[PDB]
Unconditional design. Sequence first.
Lengths: 570, 575
Amino acid sequence: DVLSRMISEKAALHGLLNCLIKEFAIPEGYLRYEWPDEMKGIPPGAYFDGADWKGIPMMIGLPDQLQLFVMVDRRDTFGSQHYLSDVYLRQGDWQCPDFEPLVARLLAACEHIAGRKNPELYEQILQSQRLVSAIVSHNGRQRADAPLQHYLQSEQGLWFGHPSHPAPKARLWPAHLGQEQWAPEFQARAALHQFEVPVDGLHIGANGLTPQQVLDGFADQQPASPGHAIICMHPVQAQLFMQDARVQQLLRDNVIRDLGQSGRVASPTASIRTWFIDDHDYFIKGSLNVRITNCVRKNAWYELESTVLIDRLFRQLLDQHADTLGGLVAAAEPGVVSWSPAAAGELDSHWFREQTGGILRENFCRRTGAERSIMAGTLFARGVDLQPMIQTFLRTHYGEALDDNALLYWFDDYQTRLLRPVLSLFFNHGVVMEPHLQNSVLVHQQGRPQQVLLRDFEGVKLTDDLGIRYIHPRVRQSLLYSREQGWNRIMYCLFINHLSETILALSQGRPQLAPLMWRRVQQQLRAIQGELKQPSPELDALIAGHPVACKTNLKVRLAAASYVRLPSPW
Amino acid sequence: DVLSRMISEKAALHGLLNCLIKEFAIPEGYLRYEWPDEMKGIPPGAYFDGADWKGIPMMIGLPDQLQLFVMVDRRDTFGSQHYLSDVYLRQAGDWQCPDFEPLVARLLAACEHIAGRKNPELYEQILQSQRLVSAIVSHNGRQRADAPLQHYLQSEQGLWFGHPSHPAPKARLWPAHLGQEQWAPEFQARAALHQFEVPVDGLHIGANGLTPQQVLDGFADQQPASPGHAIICMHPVQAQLFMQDARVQQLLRDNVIRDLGQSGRVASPTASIRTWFIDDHDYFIKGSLNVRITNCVRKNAWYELESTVLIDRLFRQLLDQHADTLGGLVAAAEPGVVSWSPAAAGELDSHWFREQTGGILRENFCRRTGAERSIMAGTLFARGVDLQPMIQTFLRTHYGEALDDNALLYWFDDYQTRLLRPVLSLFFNHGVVMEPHLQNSVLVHQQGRPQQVLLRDFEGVKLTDDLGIRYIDDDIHPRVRQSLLYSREQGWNRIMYCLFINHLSETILALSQGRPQLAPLMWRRVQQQLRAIQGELKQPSPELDALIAGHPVACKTNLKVRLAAASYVRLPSPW
Ligand SMILES: Nc1ncnc2c1ncn2[C@@H]1O[C@H](COP(=O)(O)O)[C@@H](O)[C@H]1O
Ligand SMILES: Nc1ncnc2c1ncn2[C@@H]1O[C@H](COP(=O)(O)O)[C@@H](O)[C@H]1O
């Protein structure tokens, strides 16, 4: 309980330091691995364990006459390391300030470096940590590695959320309407909200499903009277929707009808607005007009059309270019539904469509099996005891302690399945996936990696030189990336977001494996380069040793910023 | 170096904390197992590891407004626990964690307030001892941490930290100029012993089973002596002191005695400093050392030299006729004893001459036991240069694998039985009071399985008034008998302190590191063992009954007795 608060404060803190080190200290030059010239105020027990130093001293100089001390377990160029001491600060004698005080000062430091302040961020960092405390407390009695035993529990078990983010669990629910009833981390379940709507205003996109079968995937249609159909949305989305005067106007005129929470019974997933239904053919991905992680997460009209277009393309690449796809497994997105009143104003129509918009994703579990499939973020995350959960999950599958050569063999299998499809798609066809931890699902046979399923069509882009060569101009704009923009994304998602976290969780207690795992990534890049059918200059530079693009989560909140570069592990 | 220093500050702090818990806090009721009501100043990392609390909160109210906080691994009646955090202090005021010197200063001041007396000399002795430890850890810090457990001399030499419940374990007050490294077993010191040539007519020789001449050659080669003279030998620092005296100078000028410098056997001091080991020699040499080491002056008193003879005669008789009543005792013999004084000196001068020159021979048990099968207990249960209990690695090696709970309980059981039976057998059956603390004990083991617990040191053997004193022939100097004579209760306090607080408590804390739930199981095995031994005693034991039924055990002090003008306290029973 106090324990739960204490667990949450260390987790949040570690998230905030990842950002400081990655976004600011490494790019700008503020980090050195050295001991302070004067340790006054730091207790012996923070850096001395009885026999030796607890790892390596880390110092961060900060323009404002501010210093930061922390012990770490490794040197890493991507800023991935286990922190082995509390954080200490000096302006003067060293201090160990409380959570909030520490956040306040560190954020302040980042605001000077940035030249801008953010009124809202501070309260978001604290909100996020107070949820995590509620979460740890609620979930603290289960076996620690239980999230990795079933697909759904892994969506529900990203306790700490994104691991390089200042406010991972920021969720700004409306005037009451609840928290815990909608949180995956609380095993949230609910009947989806339903409306009955005239068919003249429906928009349906579909691939190999009839417009009727697309509706059937969202709602049982039988209660619809003729000339009508049933749409569903997040109960929170439905209450905000029934708060516009344009929806009240329509409900009073009996153009649309409210059917309450009468829909399929579903569990939301780590993305909050995508719902899972055990043994149904589809996940449901709706719009939620709510600030999740600082951002309204919505299905814009042209994205509803993106999705269809993308789905059809992956199907066409598979049927004809399977062997230049590098072993690709992806969840399809076969249908898309929205509603707007007939002969509505262009602006009204945008807003109705965006509010009611929904996508169907293939429930890959029917195909992969729900007890073989783990969201990649939960796989490489830490349990309620703050240990990386991967460690014991391998232990019970392997049948004993894993030696160095079993971690390297396992890693090799894993990273091969991530890199081969991603890099095949970008250089052979100009398709840009987004393989961060939360768009990837490992499929595994008794623990041995089989495939890494990739999802999320919102995140798929097409390059102007290649991909786009496979419709409305605004949809086109949404889909299009330059070859450079796209390569930055693939650099960040694959190496910094994903495998950097993979190697860290596998290499706990054994930091010497880290460069061994990096050399092996470098050797896998080479073998895949020779397997490509098109020019790959960008991959040559990465293989050479050139800097790697990295997306930012703190910095983008301070400036009026987007990406930095970090030196390459090889 | 900086790492070595920190290892020593941690080690010394822990020893001093032991004293405070054992001699003030627990007996006077200043101790509670309880979180502060306010944590400000203490960092999260000091009590929280990421998942759970690093053990149990320990807290001490010190009458002078001062309070103390330290995380410990267990609750213990004797003050035996592993400390799992730095030490924190607060007045009236946030918590803080002072450096070693201030931390020692404020702890000292608090114990002094209780006592009403200050001892700044003990303060300097605390700092001085920590510094020698700093040097010791740095000199030895590269050998394998359990190397001191592989050979007998090594075991005498690798008591890196000394007495673990003492505020100044390594403090040794030689004249400032004679150095520390040259005489320290922790620096693998060796030396030729210092010799004088002396006329035979002032020798006072005690021998059991040996001729006078064999006793002499036990200390030195008598070959360089001229007719009617012998060669006695001596700690070279003691010869420095012995030669200060005007009486000695006067013999030197008159050529009655000659100074032969350091020309005797090269030998290696052992943990008691004044007792030398020679590899493959029949005997240890135990000399006087008129220097303050730890809590006493290490002279063989003139009357202790007479009594050694009688206790050795006595032990031989017991071991020979009364075997069945001795509980399996193994004890190092002390068969010869030499000293010199001028034949025409009076009592006072003769007594003083005899204490400067006093020598005791003790049997090199390693001739029976084997050098590689023998370990001083003190070290056996001590921390290596890494601050880990050396017995852990010692046992895992000899057992091939990691020892499970049972394995440790079994090993403990074979150990305490062989320590307890002899000691209690000697005290109840015969009234012979031994002093079985960690340094008066050697474990004879076979591939790590404990075989004998040999016991040593006749200087502190006493005989009870009701029983033990019966063994001595009533034509003995009154002073020699006064020295041997304990009351039954004086006798019982000592044994209780040595057996259970000094010894097994340490055995148990070492064996049971990282597994504190074995301590009560182990104290229970101890208790069943007392009941067993009792039904085997030939005489009554109303004190053993009191102990079994959970009455408080007697505890010797090492800080309190240094502050008082009080030598003992009572601690509550483990069971
Ligand atoms: N390692 C991760 N990388 C990216 N997003 C993550 C990660 N872990 C959790 N998430 C969350 O998953 C959601 C993805 O949202 P989006 O990418 O906008 O569809 C965001 O709320 C993220 O905060
Ligand atoms: N645990 C211990 N108990 C008693 N003496 C010890 C202990 N550890 C080290 N020693 C040293 O062993 C020597 C024995 O002294 P004595 O009591 O005269 O035999 C003293 O110098 C002590 O400092």
